[PDB]
Amino acid sequence: GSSGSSGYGAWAAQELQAKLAEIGAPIQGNREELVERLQSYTRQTGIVLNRPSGPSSG
């Protein structure tokens, strides 16, 4: 039993910024601004994102 909740908060300014720029989006603004953005994108497009350098083996 673990308290698992969704949201792009745990992430870090660097991480969030990385993704945004990755999809071709401006990484300008404060943490909040960035967070809200990702949330809006996924909601609109409908493509959930996953933390970087996560699910991988090598």
UniProtKB/Swiss-Prot annotation:
Domain SAP: 8-42
Top-level taxon of origin: Eukaryota
Compartments in which it is found: Nucleus; Nucleus speckle
Function: Component of the 17S U2 SnRNP complex of the spliceosome, a large ribonucleoprotein complex that removes introns from transcribed pre-mRNAs. The 17S U2 SnRNP complex (1) directly participates in early spliceosome assembly and (2) mediates recognition of the intron branch site during pre-mRNA splicing by promoting the selection of the pre-mRNA branch-site adenosine, the nucleophile for the first step of splicing.
Subunit structure: Component of the 17S U2 SnRNP complex, a ribonucleoprotein complex that contains small nuclear RNA (snRNA) U2 and a number of specific proteins. Part of the SF3B subcomplex of the 17S U2 SnRNP complex. SF3B associates with the splicing subcomplex SF3A and a 12S RNA unit to form the U2 small nuclear ribonucleoproteins complex (U2 snRNP). Within the SF3B complex, interacts directly with SF3B4. Found in a complex with PRMT9, SF3B2 and SF3B4. Interacts (Arg-508-methylated form) with SMN1 (via Tudor domain). Interacts with RBM7. Interacts with ERCC6. Component of the minor spliceosome.
Disease named in the record: Craniofacial microsomia 1: A form of craniofacial microsomia, a disorder characterized by a spectrum of craniofacial malformations ranging from isolated microtia with or without aural atresia to underdevelopment of the mandible, maxilla, orbit, facial soft tissue, and/or facial nerve. CFM1 is an autosomal dominant form characterized by mandibular hypoplasia, microtia, facial and preauricular skin tags, epibulbar dermoids, and lateral oral clefts. Affected individuals also present skeletal and cardiac abnormalities.
Name of protein: Splicing factor 3B subunit 2
Organism this protein belongs to: Homo sapiens
Segment of the intact protein contained: 24 to 68 of 895
